[PDB]
Each structure stands twice: as C-alpha cells, then as structure tokens.
C-alpha cells in the first residue's frame, strides 16, 4: 500500500501465522502437562503476534503522535503485542528454570512497566521525555535480564537449554531498546521502514525462532 | 431515553444486579474452598456484567464508528464485559473438569484474542476487514469449543454437569458470533435494538442462567 | 510548572522512587521464597507508582473531562496506578493470612470493579452519574474491607501483623473514597492541589509507609 513499510508488516503477519499453525499442529497429540504449558505459552505468542501484526498491516494498530515538529506514525499494537507476549517469553524462560513465584511476579511486573513505560515513551508528545521513559523501560528490562542470570540445581536439559534462550534473550531483548532509540520513535536515526523490518526480524525470531528453539528439545517435557 | 434499545440495556442492568445479589447472599455461609471458587468466579461475572450493562444504559460504554457510509453506535463495554467475564465462564468450566494449566492458559489467551479480535473487528473502520477479525475471533472461539470437547476420569457429578454447561456453552457461545455477524456491527441484517436484546438475552443466560445452573449442584463442592 | 499541584506530583514521584530503591536494595540478598513474594508485591507498587506518579508530573497521566459546566483536569494515571497496585496490597494482605483462591479471586475482581468503576466515575461526563459509580466503587471497597475482617488459625506473627495493616487498611482505603467525593472529581469541595496532596499522602503511605510496616517483620518470612 501507500506505506513503504507495508511489505514488512505483511511478511511478519505471514510469518507469525504460518508459525502458529506449525506450532498448533505440532502441539496436537501432546498430552504431557508441562509440555502442554510450553506449547500453550509458546504457541500463543505468534498467535497474539499474528493478530497484532495483522492489525498493523491493515492499519488499525497505528496512531499519529506529534513531536519534534511533526506527525510521527506510531504502531502502538507492538506494545499491546509485547505486553501480552513478553511475559509469555519470560514465562517460558521462567518455568524452564522453575522460578519461585516472587521472582516471576517481579519479572512480569517489571515487564509491564517495561512495555508500559515503553508505550508511554512511544506516545509522549514531549520529545525529551520520550527518552526518560526509554531509560526507565530500559532499566526494567536491564533489571529483568539481570535476574535472567543471577536472579535465581536444574537438570542438564533445561539448563543448557537455559543458556541458549537466555543468551538469545539478552541479545534479542537488548536489541529492542537499541532499535527503539535509533528508529522513528526515538532519535529518528533509522527510517520507519527499516525500524519496522528490524522489529519484525526480532519479533519473528523472538516469537517464531525462539519458539523453534525451545520446544524442539526434551527440556520442555516432564 | 432517546435510544430505542434503552429498555433492553435497563432490563439487562436490572437482571445482572438482582442476579449478583442472589449470588452474593447465596454465597454467604459457604466455607468450602472449591465452592468458594465457583461462587467467586460465578458471582463476579454478572457483578462485572452489572457494571458494564449499567455503563451502556447510562451511555458511557458507547462509541461511534464510521463505516459503510455512516456513524454506527458501538457498545465497546460488551468486550470489556466479555474480556473479563468470558475467562470466568471458561474458568468455571475449566476448574469443573480440572484442566491442566497449559490448556487453561491456552483457553484464556485464545479468549482474549477472541474478545480482543472481536473488539478490533468492532472498531475497525474498513468494512470488509471487520469480517476478517470476526473470522479470526470465530476461529479462536471455534478453537476454544473444540477444546471444550476433545481438549482434555472425572466424578459423575462434575462430568454430567459438564455435559450441560458445555452444550449450553456451544450453543450459547456459537450464538454470539451469529448475532454479531447479523446485527449492526456486521452485516446490519438485524436492528441494533434487536441485536441488543439478543446479546442481553445471551448475557443474562450466560451470566445469570448459566450461573443458576452451575452452583445449584454438588458438582461444585469438594 | 503552571499547575499548582506540580509540587505534590514531584514530591510523590520522588518519594515513590526513593522508596522502591530502598525496597530493591533491601530485597537483594533475600532468598526465602515467601519473603521473595512480599518483596516482589511490596516493591512493585511504588515501582509502578513511581512511573505513574511521574507520568502525572510530566503531564501524560492527565486528561480533561467536561461536566457541571467546565473542563476538569483528571489524572487517570491514578486508576492505572491503583488498578495495578491495589491487588498488590490485597495480595500482600491476602498471602499474609493465607487466603483461599476463591476469596482472592473475589477481592481483585471487586478490586478492578472498584478501580474500574472509580475510573468510570472519574471520566463520566454526566455529573450525577459520577456519584453512582462512586457508590458502586465504594460498595466494592466496602465489600472488600468486609472480607478484610470476617471474610476468612494463623501464627501470632502474621496475625498481629494482620491487625495493623488491616486497620491501617480500613482507614487508608476508606479515606480514598472520601477524598474523591470531596475533591475536584466529586463535589469539588476541596481544591485539586489539596486533593492531589491527600492522595499522594495516602499513596506514599499506602505504597511506601504500608510497605515500611510489612517487610520489617518476620511476619513475611517462611
Ligand atoms: C502492571 C504490572 C504494569 C504497569 C506498568 C506501569 C506503567 C503503566 C502505564 C500505562 C499507561 C497507558 C497509557 C495509555 C493508557 C494512555 C493513552 O492516551 C494516549 C495519549 O495520552 C491516547 O493517544 C491515542 C493512541 C492510543 C493508543 C494506546 C492504546 C494501547 C492499548 C494497548 C492495551 C491493549 C489491551 C488489549 C485490549 C483488548
Ligand atoms: C538519560 C537520563 C540520565 C535518563 C533519563 C532520561 C532523561 C533525558 C534522557 C536523555 C536526554 C535528553 C537526551 C537529550 C535529548 C536532547 C539532545 C534533544 C536535542 O535537542 C533538539 C532540539 O532541542 C531535539 O530536537 C530534535 C533533534 C533530535 C534528533 C535529538 C535527539 C535526542 C536523542 C536523545 C538520545 C538519548 C540516548 C543517549 C541515551 C542513551 C544512553
Ligand atoms: C538519576 C535518578 C533521577 C535523576 C534526578 C533528576 C532531577 C531532575 O532535575 C530537574 C532538571 O533541571 C528536573 O526538573 C525539570 C523539569 C522537568 C522535571 C523532570 C523530572 C524527571 C527528570 C525526574 C524523574 C527521573 C527520571 C527517571 C530516570 C530513569 C532511570 C530510572 C533510568
Ligand atoms: C544483535 C546480535 C548480537 C547481532 C550479532 C549476531 C552475532 C552475535 C550474536 C550475539 C550472541 C552471543 C552470545 C553467545 C551465547 C553463548 C554464551 O553462553 C553462556 C554459557 O553459560 C551463557 O552465559 C552467559 C552468556 C552471555 C550472553 C549474553 C551476551 C550479551 C548480549 C549482547 C548484546 C546484544 C546486542 C544488543 C543490541 C545490539 C544489536 C546493538
Ligand atoms: C491477551 C491474552 C489477549 C490479546 C488478544 C490479541 C488481540 C488484542 C487486540 C487489543 C487491541 C485493542 C484495540 C484498542 C486498544 C484500540 C483503540 O483505538 C480505537 C480506534 O483505533 C479508539 O476508538 C475510540 C473507542 C475506544 C473504545 C475501546 C476501549 C475498550 C477498552 C476495554 C478494556 C477495559 C480494561 C478495564 C479498564 C479499567
Ligand atoms: C471469510 C474469509 C475467508 C475469512 C477472513 C475474512 C476476509 C473477508 C471476510 C468475508 C468477506 C468480505 C465478506 C465480503 C463482504 C463484501 C460482500 C462487502 C459487500 O460490498 C458492499 C459495498 O462494496 C458492502 O457495503 C455494504 C453492504 C453490506 C451489507 C455487505 C455486507 C458484507 C457481509 C460479509 C459477510 C461475511 C460472512 C459470510 C462470512 C460467514 C462465513
Ligand atoms: C486462509 C488463510 C489466509 C488467507 C490468505 C489471504 C491472502 C490475501 O490475498 C490478498 C487478497 O487479494 C490480500 O491482500 C489484499 C490487500 C489487503 C490485505 C489483506 C490481508 C489479509 C486478508 C491476510 C490475513 C488473513 C486473514 C485472517 C483469516 C482468518 C482465519 C484464521 C479464520
Ligand atoms: C440457539 C439455541 C439452539 C436456540 C434453539 C433452542 C433449542 C435448541 C437448543 C440447542 C441445544 C441442544 C444441545 C443438546 C445438549 C445435550 C447433548 O449432551 C451430550 C451428552 O454427552 C454432550 O455431548 C455433546 C453435546 C453437543 C452439544 C453441542 C450442540 C451444538 C451447538 C448448536 C449451535 C447453537 C446455535 C449457534 C447459533 C444459532 C442461534 C444460530
Ligand atoms: C476486572 C476483574 C475488573 C473489571 C471492572 C468492571 C468495570 C470495568 C470498566 C472498564 C471501562 C474502562 C473505561 C475506559 C476504557 C473508556 C475510555 O473512554 C474515555 C471516555 O469514554 C476516553 O476519554 C479520554 C481519556 C482516556 C483515559 C482512560 C485511560 C486509562 C487506561 C488505564 C489502563 C492502563 C493499562 C496499562 C497500559 C499498558
Ligand atoms: C447515592 C445513591 C443511593 C447511590 C447511587 C448514586 C445515585 C446518585 C448518587 C447520589 C446523588 C445525585 C447525588 C445528587 C447530586 C445532586 C445534588 C446534584 C446537585 O445539582 C446541581 C445542579 O443540578 C449540581 O451541579 C453542581 C453542584 C454540585 C456541587 C452538586 C454536588 C452533588 C454531590 C453529590 C453528593 C453525593 C454524596 C452524598 C453521597 C455520600 C453518601
Ligand atoms: C484517616 C485517619 C483516621 C486520620 C486520623 C489519624 C488517627 C486515627 C487513625 C485511625 C486508625 C484507628 C484504628 C486503630 C487500629 C487498632 C485496632 O486493632 C484491632 C486489634 O484486633 C483490629 O480489629 C479491628 C480494628 C478496627 C480498625 C478499623 C477502624 C475503622 C477505620 C476508620 C475510618 C478511617 C477514616 C475514613 C476516611 C476519613 C479520613 C474521613
Ligand atoms: C522449518 C521451520 C522450523 C520453520 C519455518 C516456518 C515459517 C515461518 C516462521 C519461521 C521462519 C524462520 C525461522 C525463524 C528465524 C529467524 C531468525 C527469523 C528472521 C528471518 C526472517 C526472514 C528469513 C526467512 C525465514 C522467515 C524462514
Ligand atoms: C429464581 C432464580 C433462580 C432466579 C431469578 C433472579 C432474577 C434475575 C436473573 C434470573 C432470571 C432468569 C433466569 C435466567 C435465564 C434466562 C435464559 C435469561 C433470559 C430471559 C430474559 C427475560 C425473561 C425472565 C427472566 C429474567 C426471569
Ligand atoms: C527511613 C525509611 C524507613 C524510609 C524513608 C525513605 C523515603 C521515602 C518514602 C518514605 C517516607 C516516609 C515513610 C512513609 C510514611 C508516610 C505516612 C507518608 C506521608 C508523608 C509525606 C511527607 C513526610 C515525610 C516523609 C516522606 C519521610
Ligand atoms: C515479542 C518478544 C520480545 C522479546 C520483545 C521484547 C521487547 C522489548 C524487550 C522491549 C524493551 C523496550 C525497552 C527496553 C525500551 C523502550 C521500548 C521497548 C518496549 C522497545
Ligand atoms: C458473557 C458470556 C459469554 C459466554 C460471552 C461469550 C461471547 C462470545 C463467545 C464471543 C465471540 C465473538 C466472536 C466469536 C466473534 C466476534 C465477536 C464476538 C466477541 C461476539
Ligand atoms: C495505592 C493504594 C491504595 C490502597 C489505593 C486504594 C484506593 C482506593 C481504595 C479507592 C477506592 C475508590 C473508591 C472506593 C471510590 C471511587 C474512587 C476510588 C478509586 C478513589
């Protein structure tokens, strides 16, 4: 359509949907409780992602925010996307190590403050305050990843599995605040169509790729 | 008032409130844990429903959406209603059969995508895309009901109880996407005042009736 | 800034942030599960509160509502604040006595109807209906506190601890609907800058003070 980033919203819609289906069919048959939790958690993300990517593609997940002298297109559906799918990722990581509730409660709460303050940053009309919200949202993320290491006697399956998804996690998660800071929402260094592609690349890798790495091990079975 | 559907919003407000009270007084005395969960879940729905029906009655739960050449009155409070009360219904059904977490997580998540995409459909200005959101929301519902049967060794109390509320569930739940598709939100086949009545009839039967069928058995006691 | 209540939004921002930090550092080291839940719950509130107080301070958490012949400044971030932090308080109180799920589900649900209908009251343009929402929100709160006493064999630690925070709870919680009713949102008896101070005084005492009373006892340790 008229928006150059359309192609990347369409490709991400497509990869999120083909990914959930894969996951659905993959999930049919399974009857292991625990396994019935990663499939759930793991399948729902691009499931939710699918709808949120489609809401962007069709234009619903978009709003205009004025700042720095203009009308900046802002896809709030991302935050609705992540606010629902980041704890799924942290729940998959959490259940993985068997985290006590107090820390899981601490992770999703920092999580909604992370997405929550990320979304506040996204829609704040005062340019310099956008970077205050980023800094608090980055400190919460920066907080979560700190727990993601020394925040916690596991089986060598889930654990080695835990190294991967955590390292893929720091790099992936930390890449998100850099793309925000450099794209149209932040300094405006990188064009929205490139930022959209970077986010869809992280989202598909986060949703589908990270998905394709977790459930393909017996780290998930009880 | 000026809106012909007012009478049905007022009657539903009334039946939701008299229903929660019934449930409240009914619930006082009870000290069985499990039983303390159906009363909770079961009472809260028309409790929440009451407030959401009243917000419609008083006009707050209403917004105007342009499409197909006009300003269509849209009661978003329904989705806020269902987004909060449909998992209560699925939690009552779920706890009922004792569903593992992975499937309960899978049901509420499809559930918020169901209400979530239903609400997206409801407020999307592009007429043909409204029917795409309906189709995904119907596929999630269509998904949930599929689990509602072959998605799972129970006592003959909860189980026979489970036949009822599930069958009342498929017919009730499946009636909702038909009323949406045929009313003002969808094809506009049926007037808003008739659609409102159908929804309030399903909502009262869903909230109060379905309520009046569950807790009046020892299928709920531990 | 131009708003006289700014000073109180700035002080509350500050006290909420210094308070979470205190709590964070206090929380580092702890490895007791249960204790890892009060710190979580307890720390997150002024954590969330911090961001919501800052969103008010910077102007984001504010909207204008017309009624009684004018444009009344309304800080919706409070409800987003409380909707997220009141169940944390009730979870701290709940876990404290070890409440069965049915009642905890019943408390947060009345809770979101309390904040939920409080927020509806806050943004309703019809003046007399604002007081209907207050009355339902007060009845839910009035409901929660009723459970807060006779809504439930505990250790003399958590229990005596329970007397305090509950009594501090009724007075604190009940003070909130009085400040609402008397401030700019309600009868307009008390100026917004005084109402803001009263709420920040309750919020800081609720978030930080109530915080500073709970975790400083072994009522929290397992
Ligand atoms: C807990 C634990 C975590 C709490 C974290 C602390 C920080 C929380 C902050 C929150 C505040 C949200 C801000 C937002 C509600 C305010 C919207 O106002 C915008 C401009 O002021 C409206 O612009 C117009 C554009 C609008 C677009 C915004 C809509 C988005 C909504 C996404 C949520 C969805 C929920 C699924 C719905 C079904
Ligand atoms: C950082 C704090 C300690 C934590 C809390 C956040 C408080 C303030 C955040 C950082 C701070 C403002 C950034 C200052 C931005 C400032 C240079 C704006 C430049 O002025 C120009 C016109 O006045 C902006 O118009 C348009 C020109 C623009 C392209 C300017 C872009 C500004 C960019 C901000 C970059 C911030 C990242 C360094 C921080 C990475 C660490
Ligand atoms: C470091 C810590 C907080 C830093 C303190 C700051 C003090 C602000 O001084 C004034 C700048 O002249 C702010 O008022 C100037 C008018 C405006 C007020 C801005 C107030 C905010 C900048 C204060 C909120 C702190 C921010 C959050 C920094 C995020 C951090 C947690 C990553
Ligand atoms: C964005 C990508 C990097 C693009 C570059 C692609 C090639 C580089 C991939 C990065 C990855 C490397 C991490 C290796 C892992 C293996 C380490 O496993 C250890 C075994 O116990 C885990 O302990 C602890 C493990 C530690 C792992 C955390 C590493 C740190 C995260 C690095 C930051 C990232 C980049 C943040 C945004 C960036 C794009 C600007
Ligand atoms: C999880 C698991 C499930 C996630 C499911 C995936 C699909 C999620 C989609 C969500 C997106 C919600 C759309 C909505 C936020 C966007 C609002 O923008 C409208 C037009 O663009 C505003 O019109 C003006 C009218 C506006 C009316 C809309 C308001 C409604 C809000 C209902 C929520 C309430 C929460 C209780 C509040 C206290
Ligand atoms: C169905 C897909 C495979 C799943 C994903 C959804 C993608 C598209 C959804 C179905 C599809 C559009 C419906 C096409 C509607 C089309 C006839 C609109 C008619 O054109 C008129 C003017 O151009 C509409 O104006 C006003 C006149 C109106 C009264 C027209 C009403 C249209 C109605 C749509 C009915 C859809 C239900 C069949 C689908 C039940 C299955
Ligand atoms: C069946 C499955 C998905 C169907 C594929 C469709 C392909 C769309 O082709 C073009 C129509 O000319 C859409 O671009 C035309 C311009 C516009 C783009 C519309 C894109 C969407 C129609 C694609 C999203 C699929 C929808 C979801 C169908 C719901 C289903 C899960 C019940
Ligand atoms: C809207 C109402 C139907 C209006 C008509 C009122 C009279 C008909 C009531 C329908 C009901 C009939 C179902 C009977 C039930 C009893 C079956 O129990 C079985 C015992 O194991 C359960 O297995 C499996 C049981 C199976 C039950 C699922 C049935 C299917 C659901 C039928 C669809 C409904 C209609 C969807 C919307 C409609 C209004 C257009
Ligand atoms: C469950 C259990 C509990 C359910 C309780 C029953 C009562 C629920 C009622 C809810 C309804 C919410 C009303 C609101 C969505 C409607 C907004 O419309 C306003 C005027 O109509 C918009 O004005 C413009 C101003 C707007 C400001 C309102 C925004 C606020 C949003 C706060 C939520 C945040 C979520 C964190 C986001 C990240
Ligand atoms: C109470 C019900 C049984 C429960 C459900 C709620 C339904 C109605 C709520 C109470 C009721 C209206 C309050 C009536 C307000 C009425 C006096 C408004 C006064 O009229 C003036 C112009 O017409 C208001 O303009 C501006 C002048 C204003 C300053 C008037 C302020 C009105 C105040 C309302 C005070 C209500 C508290 C008593 C209730 C405490 C118990
Ligand atoms: C707003 C403050 C009161 C300002 C005044 C400051 C001095 C008065 C502090 C009030 C407090 C007094 C409560 C004492 C407590 C000790 C009782 O403990 C009992 C031991 O089992 C608990 O049983 C049951 C205990 C019972 C406790 C519940 C008391 C009731 C709550 C009183 C209402 C408050 C005021 C509501 C708003 C007001 C500000 C208009
Ligand atoms: C064969 C299997 C395992 C999966 C393929 C199903 C297709 C849809 C989504 C999965 C695609 C690829 C794996 C995810 C990995 C990535 C790091 C995602 C970023 C790349 C984006 C475009 C490149 C191609 C791919 C989408 C296959
Ligand atoms: C006597 C008991 C069990 C309940 C009556 C309390 C009143 C309020 C709500 C309950 C009403 C009726 C039972 C619910 C069943 C229905 C299928 C609802 C649809 C009907 C709507 C109008 C018809 C009358 C009734 C509301 C009694
Ligand atoms: C020394 C410790 C325990 C705490 C101090 C850290 C500072 C920040 C927040 C804590 C402040 C005070 C305790 C909370 C109690 C109150 C009833 C709050 C209302 C008072 C507001 C202003 C008065 C001063 C104080 C904020 C210290
Ligand atoms: C969908 C999956 C992933 C893991 C999404 C993760 C996204 C982030 C981790 C976001 C952090 C953000 C922060 C830290 C800074 C401001 C805005 C963001 C929301 C992009
Ligand atoms: C309040 C109780 C009940 C069971 C509500 C159930 C409602 C639905 C099941 C809705 C499904 C919808 C779908 C399937 C299609 C588009 C829009 C709806 C939200 C009405
Ligand atoms: C942040 C901590 C506390 C305990 C906040 C508690 C707030 C209330 C208890 C609010 C009740 C309200 C009611 C009862 C009446 C209408 C509006 C309010 C939301 C202020």
SS3 string of chain B?
CCCCCHHHHHHHHHHHHHHHHHHHHHHCCCCCCCHHHHHHHHHHHHHHHHHHHHHHHCCCCCEEEEECCEEEEECCHHHHHHHHHHHHHHHHHHHHHCCCHHHHHHHHHHHHHHHHHHHHHHHCCCHHHHHHHHHHHHHHHHHHHHHHHHCCCCCHHHHHHHHHHHHHHHHHHHHHHHHHHHCCCCCCCCCHHHHHHHHHHHHHHHHHHHHHHHCCCCCCCC
Which residues does chain C have within 8 Å of residue A106's beta carbon, measured at their own beta carbons? 39-40, 43-44
Q: What is the DSSP letter of A60?
A: T
Residue B121 Cα to ligand 6 midpoint, Å, equals 12
Q: What value, to the nearest 5°, has the Cα angle with vertex A19 and ends A13 and A22?
A: 145
Q: Which residues contact A206 (CB under 8 A, 6 or more apart)?
A: A45, A85, A89, A172
Query: Alpha-carbon dihedral of residues B123, B128, B133, B137, nearest 10 degrees?
Result: 120
Sign of the CA dihedral running B93, B98, B101, B106: negative
Distance CA B43, CA B22 (A): 9
Distance CA B40, CA B87 (A): 13
* φ and ψ of B64, to 5 deg: -105, 130
The protein residue whose alpha carbon is closest to atom 12 in ligand 6 is B128
Q: What SS3 class is residue C29?
A: coil
Q: C151: closest CA among C96, C112, C217? A: C96
The answer to whether A105 contacts C43, with C-beta atoms less than 8 Å apart, is no
Are A34 and A221 in contact, with CB atoms under 8 Å apart? yes
Instruction: Give the DSSP H/E element, type plus range, for residue C142.
Output: helix C127-150
Sign of the CA dihedral running B23, B208, C177, C38: positive
**Does C178 contact ligand 11 (Cβ within 6 A)?**
yes
Distance CA B79, CA B116 (A): 8
Distance CA B115, CA B83 (A): 6
Q: What is the DSSP letter of A63?
A: E
Q: Which of A100, A113, A129 sits opposite C51 (nearest CB)?
A: A113
Tokens of A118: 């990320």
Q: What SS3 class is residue A74?
A: strand
A71: β partners:
A66
Atom of ligand 2 nearest to the CA of A186: 33
**Does B19 contact ligand 13 (Cβ within 6 A)?**
yes
Residue A139 Cα to ligand 1 midpoint, Å, equals 19
What's the CATH code, domain B1-222? 1.20.1070.10
Distance CA A133, CA A185 (A): 12
Q: A3: closest CA among A62, A52, A49, A53? A: A62
Q: Which of A100, A113, A126 sits opposite C58 (nearest CB)?
A: A126
Distance CA C5, CA C57 (A): 9
Distance CA C39, CA C45 (A): 10
**Does C154 contact ligand 10 (Cβ within 6 A)?**
no
Q: What SS3 class is residue A203?
A: helix
Distance CA A186, CA A183 (A): 6
A70: β partners:
A67
Instruction: Give the DSSP H/E element, type plus range, for residue A65.
Output: strand A63-67
> At how many Å resolution was this determined?
1.6
| Chains with at least 3 CB pairs less than 8 angstroms from chain A | B, C
**Does B201 contact ligand 13 (Cβ within 6 A)?**
yes
Tokens 């808003």 belong to B192
Are C102 and B40 in contact, with CB atoms under 8 Å apart? yes
Residue C14 Cα to ligand 11 midpoint, Å, equals 27
CA separation (Å) from C142 to B36, B45, B102, C85?
20, 19, 36, 18
Q: Give the method used.
A: X-ray
Taking the CA of residue C96 and the nearest CA in chain A, the distance in Å comes to: 14
**Does C27 contact ligand 10 (Cβ within 6 A)?**
no
Give A110-165 as a DSSP string.
HHHHHHHHHHHHHH-SSHHHHHHHHHHHHHHHHHHHHHHHHT----HHHHHHHHHH
Domain spans of chain A, in order of start: 1-222
Give the β-pairing of A63-67 and A70-74.
antiparallel
Sign of the CA dihedral running A166, A171, A176, A177: positive
Tokens of A129: 């305050």
C132: β partners:
none
Residue B114 Cα to ligand 16 midpoint, Å, equals 7
Long-range residue pairs from A188-197, CB within 8 A, at least 24 positions apart, any chain: A188/A68, A192/A4, A192/A5, A192/A73, A193/A4, A193/A5, A193/A8, A196/A5, A196/A8, A196/A9, A196/A75, A197/A5, A197/A8
């Amino acid at each position: 359509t008229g928006r150059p980033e359309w192609i990347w919203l369409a490709l991400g819609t497509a990869l999120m949907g083909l990914g959930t289906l894969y996951f659905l069919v993959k999930g049919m048959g399974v009857s292991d409780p625990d396994a019935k939790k990663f499939y759930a958690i793991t399948t729902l993300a691009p499931a939710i992602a699918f709808t949120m990517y489609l809401s962007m593609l069709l234009g619903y997940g978009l709003t205009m925010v004025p700042f720095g002298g203009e009308q900046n297109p802002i896809y709030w559906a991302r935050y609705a996307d992540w606010l629902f799918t980041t704890p799924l990722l942290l729940l998959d990581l959490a259940l993985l190590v068997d985290a006590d509730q107090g820390t899981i409660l601490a992770l999703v709460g920092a999580d909604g403050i992370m997405i929550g303050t990320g979304l506040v940053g996204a829609l704040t009309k005062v340019y310099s305050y956008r970077f205050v919200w980023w800094a608090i949202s980055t400190a919460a993320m920066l907080y979560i990843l700190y727990v993601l290491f020394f925040g916690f006697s596991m089986r060598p399956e889930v654990a080695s599995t835990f190294k991967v998804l955590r390292n893929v996690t720091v790099v992936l998660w930390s890449a998100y605040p850099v793309v925000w800071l450099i794209g149209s929402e932040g300094a405006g260094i990188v064009p929205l169509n490139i930022e959209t592609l970077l986010f869809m690349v992280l989202d598909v890798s986060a949703k589908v790729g990270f998905g394709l790495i977790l459930l393909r091990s017996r780290a998930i079975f009880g």
